[PDB]
Amino acid sequence: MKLSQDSSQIELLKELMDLQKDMVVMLLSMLEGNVVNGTIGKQMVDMLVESSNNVEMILKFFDMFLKLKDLTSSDTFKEYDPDGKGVISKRDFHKA
C-alpha cells in the first residue's frame, strides 16, 4: 500500500512482489503431500488466523487490482476515447 501511492519505487514494488511470490510458493510446497487431517494444515490455518488482518488486506489489494482488467476493456472504456495510445483526461476515467 505504501509503495503504490507514489512513483519512483516501481522497482522496489516489483522486487517485493517477487519476494512475496517466492514466499507463497515456499509455504505452498509444504502441502504437496498433505492429508485431510495433517498437522501442517493445522499449523498453516493457525498462522493464518494469527495474521488474518494482513492477509485480508493483501486479498483486498489483489481483488481491487484483478477487478480492473475486465472492468475497463470490456464495455465502455475501450471505446470512450479511441485515438491511439491510451490517453485519458483522468476525469472520464473516474466516472467510468
Curated annotation (Swiss-Prot):
Highly expressed in heart, lung, cerebellum and brain. Detected at lower levels in adrenal gland, stomach, thymus, esophagus and ovary. It comes from the Eukaryota. Channel activity is modulated by phosphorylation. Phosphorylation is increased in failing heart, leading to calcium leaks and increased cytoplasmic Ca(2+) levels. Disruption phenotype: Embryonically lethal. Embryos die at about 10 dpc, due to defects in heart tube development. Cardiac myotubes display enlarged rough endoplasmic reticulum and cytoplasmic vesicles that contain high levels of Ca(2+). It is found in: Sarcoplasmic reticulum membrane. Cytosolic calcium-activated calcium channel that mediates the release of Ca(2+) from the sarcoplasmic reticulum into the cytosol and thereby plays a key role in triggering cardiac muscle contraction. Aberrant channel activation can lead to cardiac arrhythmia. In cardiac myocytes, calcium release is triggered by increased Ca(2+) cytosolic levels due to activation of the L-type calcium channel CACNA1C. The calcium channel activity is modulated by formation of heterotetramers with RYR3. Required for cellular calcium ion homeostasis. Required for embryonic heart development. Belongs to the ryanodine receptor (TC 1.A.3.1) family. RYR2 subfamily. The calcium release channel activity resides in the C-terminal region while the remaining part of the protein resides in the cytoplasm. Homotetramer. Can also form heterotetramers with RYR1 and RYR3. Interacts with CALM and S100A1; these interactions regulate channel activity. Identified in a complex composed of RYR2, FKBP1B, PKA catalytic subunit, PRKAR2A, AKAP6, and the protein phosphatases PP2A and PP1. Interacts directly with FKBP1B, PKA, PP1 and PP2A. Interacts with FKBP1A and FKBP1B; these interactions may stabilize the channel in its closed state and prevent Ca(2+) leaks. Interacts with SELENON. Identified in a complex, composed of FSD2, CMYA5 and RYR2. This is Ryanodine receptor 2. It comes from Mus musculus (Mouse). The lineage of its organism: Eukaryota, Metazoa, Chordata, Craniata, Vertebrata. The chain holds residues 3955 to 4050 of 4966 of the full protein.
